[PDB]
A paper describes a structure:
All [name] orthologs share a characteristic N-terminal [name] [name] domain and a C-terminal bromodomain. Additional functional studies allowed us to characterize the normal function of [name], and to show that it is a general auxiliary factor targeting acetylated histones and facilitating chromatin-templated processes by maintaining chromatin accessible. However, in contrast to FACT, [name] bears a bromodomain capable of specifically guiding the protein toward acetylated histones where it could act as a molecular motor thanks to its [name] [name] domain. To elucidate the structural basis of the [name]–histone interaction, we co-crystallized the [name] bromodomain with peptides derived from the acetylated H4 tail.
We previously found the preference of [name] bromodomain for multiple acetylated histone tails, and we had observed that mouse [name] preferentially binds to H4K5ac. Consequently, we focussed on H4 acetylated on K5 and K12. Hence, the purified [name] bromodomain was crystallized with H4 tail peptides monoacetylated at either of these two sites. As described for other bromodomains, water molecules occupy the bottom of the acetyl-lysine binding site. The H4K12ac-containing peptide forms only backbone or water-mediated interactions with the [name] bromodomain, and the hydrophobic residue L10 adopts a seemingly unfavourable position next to a polar surface pocket (lower right).
Residue numbers in the entry:
A (entry chain B): 9 to 13
B (entry chain A): 979 to 1108
The structure:
């Protein structure tokens, strides 16, 4: 997914 | 009645204890605070009802949970949010999903061993009378 950076 | 308020106070004590035990588990660190909206701005777009263990404590203290069922709806939400936001096969996503399912399973297992079914039943009956 977009991830948590 | 004051007896019913005593019941709900016992429920809050029980729920804080369960939540604390989840919160101190190293595996569940990622669920202890809200996803930071400044560092992960896409999160609030995707996940319509963010939930985390700190928010659960706040809700307990606000008397938002009158049953363990309603509490478990929020634990379920922590889990389902993680599965939705992190759905891919890469190891980072798989790890958070596994932790989320472990959080859910742990909460349910503690409740199975430690919640008296008649206590929960009483809570549900007071709630339904209001």
């Amino acid at each position: 997914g977009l991830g948590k950076g | 009645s004051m007896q019913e308020e005593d019941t709900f106070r016992e429920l809050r004590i029980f729920l804080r204890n369960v939540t604390h035990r989840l919160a101190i588990d190293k595996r569940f660190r990622v669920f202890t605070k809200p996803v930071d909206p400044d560092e992960v701005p896409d999160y609030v777009t995707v996940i319509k009802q963010p939930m985390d263990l700190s928010s659960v404590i706040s809700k307990i203290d606000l008397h938002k949970y009158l049953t363990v069922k309603d509490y478990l709806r929020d634990i379920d939400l922590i889990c389902s949010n993680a599965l939705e936001y992190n759905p891919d096969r890469d190891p980072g996503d798989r790890l958070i999903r596994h932790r989320a399912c472990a959080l859910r399973d742990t909460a349910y297992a503690i409740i199975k061993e430690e919640l008296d079914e008649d206590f929960e039943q009483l809570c549900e009956e007071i709630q339904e009378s209001r």
